[model samples]
Target chain A: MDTSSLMEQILSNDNLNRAYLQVVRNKGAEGVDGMKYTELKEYLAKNGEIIKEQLRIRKYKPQPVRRVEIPKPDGGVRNLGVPTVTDRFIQQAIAQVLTPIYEEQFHDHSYGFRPNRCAQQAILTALDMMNDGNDWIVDIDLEKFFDTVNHDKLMTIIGRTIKDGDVISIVRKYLVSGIMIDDEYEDSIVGTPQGGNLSPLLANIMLNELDKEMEKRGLNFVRYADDCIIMVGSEMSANRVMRNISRFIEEKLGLKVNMTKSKVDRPRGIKYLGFGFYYDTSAQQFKAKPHAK
Target chain B: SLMEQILSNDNLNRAYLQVVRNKGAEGVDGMKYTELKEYLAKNGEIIKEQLRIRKYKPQPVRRVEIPKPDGGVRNLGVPTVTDRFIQQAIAQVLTPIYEEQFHDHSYGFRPNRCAQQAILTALDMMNDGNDWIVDIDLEKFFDTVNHDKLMTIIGRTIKDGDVISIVRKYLVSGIMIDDEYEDSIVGTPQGGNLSPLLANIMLNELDKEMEKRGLNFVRYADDCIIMVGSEMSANRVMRNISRFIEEKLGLKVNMTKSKVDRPRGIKYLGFGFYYDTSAQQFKAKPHAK
Candidate 1:
């Protein structure tokens, strides 16, 4: 899993083919470059070796993403930067290589966008944390973790363990290459594209910095991407944890916490990950149920 | 009145907006979605007047066919956009009323309830010594529901005559494809907006009936699974459900598709159960599709 062998594995025809299969299975739209995933099979079959060489020698530059804005539940929009299928293939290749290395670094409670980890497992885990008299929950709302992630900090973090400049350079090209909007191109600076294959991996990388610290403090917390719920025993500990974690998130991680939505409260009736937790009075056991969404 | 609530200006506005948000093909009238908004704006009051006078009647639904995974085709009735808008408005008003009535265990198509909850709920039941499960598969419950029975169930407490009439009209709105037409005497139209809630209300009869018999079960739409203490109980429960649905609700249970088995062999909501003695826990695990 070391970065030296990482590149060779990533550039291997096997890894490239595996990465290609992953992209095709995900079934995405044509990006700004309009390379169809259906067509990627032949596209790679004809030009696979040269493409691998381009990646190895650092001659490859990712194409601009097709920028799309999705309307929100409220009167707002979610920005998605869809990478070209080719770029997505490359991202998936690097991600598949890096996942094992990073997976070891990730704490169990940090269960967002990781392989074989899901919100249901995290919900039960949070419920388990709520046991042993830890009732107070510090549920923090992140404004835009994806949009506002510090790119230089991210690259620096990636560089710490990922020593291969080839992998780093390709990902850097993707980050900086920006997106296409109505035939106009805009440069990206602050965040990863939401729709790209690498974005969740990148987001996890950014948030794990916060996770590493929280686990250091031994906080009984559950985080799925940007959403967090840190369980504590009392209101005093709850606020203290919230305040300190909020500071750590803002000051160290460079992410904004939406105080308006975030709160410190008893776990009873508190909603997290589309579930509402409560103590069943008759059953005398803590339980969770799906909210009437 | 439920009629007033269903026909409220605010409700109508929300319905139209929601209808616009949801994607659909045009119905028998050949009215495009793009023209619906302005057309409704011009004739909103005109339709409202007809609805109030009990003179409003829905056009025959455009019959469509969706191919099943096994190459079988499922019938879908595409109502006119305006009718869809009306159904949406009525559903908006009726949702809160029926949402309160639906059993907590019924997770199908209802707001806030989902397959995960049903899966987890089954897990809890399994842990509670209800290992024998009746994985009940009702044969095409949506397409085979008795219309008069459905309307009767809806009109039981939701007593506004006008609302009931409008809903009844929708249920009776027969099929039309090109120049051909077929009468609809049974079953709520599959793709119709109100059918989901109507189905829930209809099955709510089954839900309550099961409760009266003190049965332990969970239902997600028609995908219900009843748990019992032993295999005999599972068999008994399966037979009881089949008979009850056939006699009371006038729907058939696909006896072949329906199985009475232990949790280890049965899958519910994409999950199967396994027990660990050392851990003293019944864990629900995801099954391969």
Candidate 2:
């Protein structure tokens, strides 16, 4: 409600045009519609006014995302939803407008999905925490974070900041918008589509719910996207935080914590933010490095 | 009641024979498998006589709120097995007559037709100068299809009052929701065997109007996309049809969900169309990732 002006600015031509240039620079492949990244300029030229008008009036419907399946760790594949360049630009525009407001709400621990902060920084922060003798790291794995994030809960969380109903329904429609498989259509009943333009930020928003609550519990944690590590001193302390945090994640945030994969252990074993920790006997300290992607 | 007329009607006999060949289905009064078998064997002649003498009264639909993926509920109506059989018989008779008159562009709920076919036609039209996309949506189509308007629309082809009265009886048969009975005055119950066919017939007016206006489009059920040459015509056609449905057919247009745009990739059915770079032609692909 208060962000009505920001909503106006988000849907503004100058802002959308700016976002369009950024989207073009970021370049992606064709969506299910077979609309190439290159066709965007001309396509926008023809339908930009209509698209903008529809978005302003709340008639703009994003098509089902084109899906591509890639391998997961075990045996199966994970689904990735690729939005049309037009939808991508719209998402980027919304993100650009809303970032300034949401960016301030997050703590230093959440390094992913922000403008400049990153996984590397999160890794360095976790490594520093380990060297500080809080070496018992509880590696947290929240299964299918993007695909399982609850839409109803997300809307409630987002509505607090972005009070505009129009903007909220825009996000609402995107969450429920189905994905296209080969010759079939499937609904995105629970989560935002993975590989979506706003997904990283949306995931960040949901994760920040945990980030804020964990900070309230006064724990030192490093989170880069869904990969998280809550640094603690003893196995006993890690064990407790492990128990309390998973309950907090599901109960407070409406998300699932991977009970099997999630554990309380020393820092040397598990990875944090795509980096692993090791103790250097010569320096008598801990160091971290990136893992194979 | 066209009593004697429908009794000997060839279509009625055809449907009755078809039902004889037929064997989930519990309605408001759920008849179990063996019970239904015995009931049919004991009352087959009686049930046939009830229809033959025009004394059949259709039962109310059993409304059920099924679970959705996101923990929401979907409202569905399940008609009784006997009523479904009768509806099927009626639909079997109505199918060929309307099938002869329906336009080629309207493809939903028809035999041997799928959404992909509509997708193909849309992409093919895009190959020419037709790229301006006009997407249309009817608000709560099944639940809000006006009862009287539907009958009038159906009346244009079939002059048989017997068929008309039977259709009207099904329309007003009422729906049982949460074990409470509610009267049906507006829309048809969504899950009946005849609902889709009736919907097609009602929406067929809009389908015909599109072609009569000389516009190019493909419609599946209530969802349709009109492709034209210019943006100005696109907006014009959109308003014209919006007015047509509102004024002529008494249907509300969901303008908030409707739009006019260029073929940035029109969403037809569940899939979308794109110019294939490798094949050097247009192709249909699901929006799934």
Candidate 3:
């Protein structure tokens, strides 16, 4: 129909029908949703001016921050890129997802070379017990230590390895969106919570914090990346150390240790890091994580 | 399918059995927990038959022409290409260390605080084949790298346009996440599987600072060995470089770890090999560090 003809038809509608037609034209105005059309007509007639004015004002408001062209995942450019707030929020979520992975993988490590905190604690405690003039022995060892690593944390730790801003941002984007990592065998894809950019910094930061916390507790810890040699003194101390590890990982780093896969053995000589800890009656030496066999 | 086939192969199966025994994980159901050797012998026959009769089809392989050894048409996915470009950039950071200090030995895959002495070796070669070494250790190398100074180095050093763009982005927007590090100035980490790579890259900043004064140095990443004309020169270079590194990287060097040795056959990077002044041959020292 012609514009004038459509308008003429609207002009011909009765007052009551016009009110009914107005309700039908507006969105979210399911006229008489719970009541009759008579009730709707009465409500709209009573408050139509307030509703119309409110909608007009809302449509006219200005948005802060102009849109900028951003490179897409495929390197194509688009003006309708992500918002700054959305980007930062996504990064935080990604980091949150990755923090646990880092905590689990590096729970016992500091990625630094030398004796970390737990090792020092165990040594001191063992010496204190041996002050009563008991003969001491120690054992130590180094096992295939990579598998125990929490991948999320390691990746975050690795992410710190990035120096490019765009590269880091890209990594953060994938990390936040759920990174699909292919296994080394290239046979399958694994959906893992991995650190993208800030994850590494976060991991390092958590490690430093944990070290300080351990120092405050007078616990000895030794770490070099994934290698940790703790002089866990008594069975109780060992258990306490393990428990503290669990708590730190969960609370600070947002991770949980799978200690079930890890064998808990308390002996005179224990292997920590790549050394063996030998415990005879009273003393123990640091050793590497022993072979499962 | 290929994996199953490989797993079922008689030799592969036998190896898997051996590995199972070695680890002592729970045996497969219907398979006994008895000695693995005995189990392997008994089940070995049955497994061979199973393998021969295995019906799994290998996934069809789609053939594509291999790119020539020379530069050719390469299909690098966007992120992959970006990763490679980033890696190449990181490689530039590693090049000087490799060419100057590591030319004599193969680093292979190991990374640590040892790539700092290559320049010292080069200096030794320059100084009539005389061995002069000074060991300097950066205080908290990772935490200490000066963000601004490193950016300046990236601007001056990195040649690739794409890499420069990435570096520039990082300089303007360094991302930091929540963590409990006491230090407030630590820059957020970037890169994946690029920690050691970036660290090695940042070492170039150290090199640039040392090179400013025309003082020659070698590095195995964070491990620096400054070679000088005399003990006095070595001391001056060491002090200057230490201060430069501290000022540039935001962290101090551990003076206690700094070892001062004569410009003779001094052990460096786990070995005591040096430029022999008499024969001009890089020979092994009587003892190594």
Candidate 4:
């Protein structure tokens, strides 16, 4: 039983079909390759068996992405690469196969792009512990996370956990293909592309090891992608854990810890995931306050 | 003859007085409901008459910020009782005219049509099994609505100069922020009775365009759902519709919440739809409140 065939069969399921359709709808007619959305859909429908076989044999290659620079709110242009319709479908198919396996390895506190989890959950998890006298919480943010993730390192982590050989190769091709930024094509030597469909999953795979290490060390923390919050028992403990975690993230993971965003403070005083927890002495519990943009 | 009079002054007076009767404490100045009604009947008539004969100065809206659950606060314009009376009367007069212009698919803050009607109709289409559905969520649909575009749409339906000018004045009325008054250059005030009517009229343009394109859709205020055949068709329609909404209508479509997929299981208007295998029909799955 070839896993790629199994993956192909899984694509036709209602849940997977629902998931793939959403991404397709979100991607719309925008594509990197010459293929229009309607044409690509017809192509996939017409050559389903061939494409499935190609995927199974590790012969499928994703097309180079069309990079478009969008203006950021804080000033400066951010490069966003749009993937082809076919490549998106393949990415989604791969996502469906890897999500369940990778999900088990991910920490319960980690909530970025995972199933049945969100930023609110991560915040709520930390907020729920506010009454337990663990007042000291460290809010950690990674500087240029998606733009600075090492592809080779992520692939190594993926390779360690993922057993399927074809999926790994296909992901590697997606990572290495880079993106066409305007008229010039730049190969991605470091970090994942910001706007690619597979970037979220790749980032998650990279961070899974850090999550496990924290859990093994018995550290109380919650992570929503790059935004992490660690709760400690005391100020001294907070200082020690913050330094340890920051060093681990920077040195071991090769990702920069944004000192400006990373700070140890009272849990009630900090805001996370659009919510601010305030200690309500009257209720003897932490009350949730929504953050104004 | 009696019916004609009933539709004119008597009806308008009753509608105006009805809204005035249920006035809240947050009106302009500190006038009581009874005092406000009396003042409107006397001074309100005199003021409108003065405007018609002498000057065209409309009353300024008293703006107050109400705290929202999402941490931020929204600006609510509390007009004078006179203005409220005029708005209700205008709504009464315009209801029949605008109701006829509204499409059968639109059901947002309108009489007879509601979220229930929109959801059931969509479910019926999905149960037919050839239709793929796209659930659309508009980003701050009420706040993002272009007032100029809205006034233009309303201008099409209204021909009377007095009515149109008054409506336009109300549409572009400035709010008092602290002690200083400032003009609302963009969206209409959310709390006003005129807000819903204006929002619906603005969205009616999108509805009319989709109708012209022969695309099927149901809209409840900002919650729009486009129904199509096949996953590809759904995607194609979503792209076209999203572009039209963002580019033409100048409204932002929230992509995260919007999705195109099979209608076997979807949550729309607080109701869910799942395919019942035994009955071989799509059945309603009501979520617990």
**Cα RMSD for candidate 1?**
21.4
True contacts kept of 4: 0.00
Docking tier of model 2: it is: incorrect
Interface RMSD of each: 21.4, 26.0, 26.1, 18.7
Evaluated on the second chain alone, the candidates' TM-scores are: 0.85, 0.82, 0.43, 0.76
lDDT minimum window of 10 residues, candidate 3 chain B = B178-187
Each candidate's root-mean-square deviation in Å? 21.4, 23.6, 30.8, 17.9
Note the residue pairs that clash in candidate 1.
A293-B112
Q: Is candidate 2 or candidate 3 better by TM-score?
A: 2
Every model's TM-score = 0.50, 0.47, 0.26, 0.46
lDDT of 4 by residue, A191-270 (tens): 11233456676777777778887898898788766667788889998899889888888888888887777788896567
Give fnat (model 2): 0.00
lDDT of candidates 1 onward, in order: 0.71, 0.67, 0.37, 0.61
Best by TM-score: 1
Q: List the residue pairs that clash in candidate 2.
A: A1-A163, A67-B288, A67-B289, A68-B289, A179-B287, A179-B288, A180-B287, A180-B288, A181-B288
Q: Which stretches in model 3 have alpha-carbon errors above 4 Å?
A: A1-293, B1-132, B146-152, B155-193, B263-265, B273-282, B285-289
lDDT value, candidate 1, whole model: 0.71
The CAPRI class of candidate 1 is: incorrect
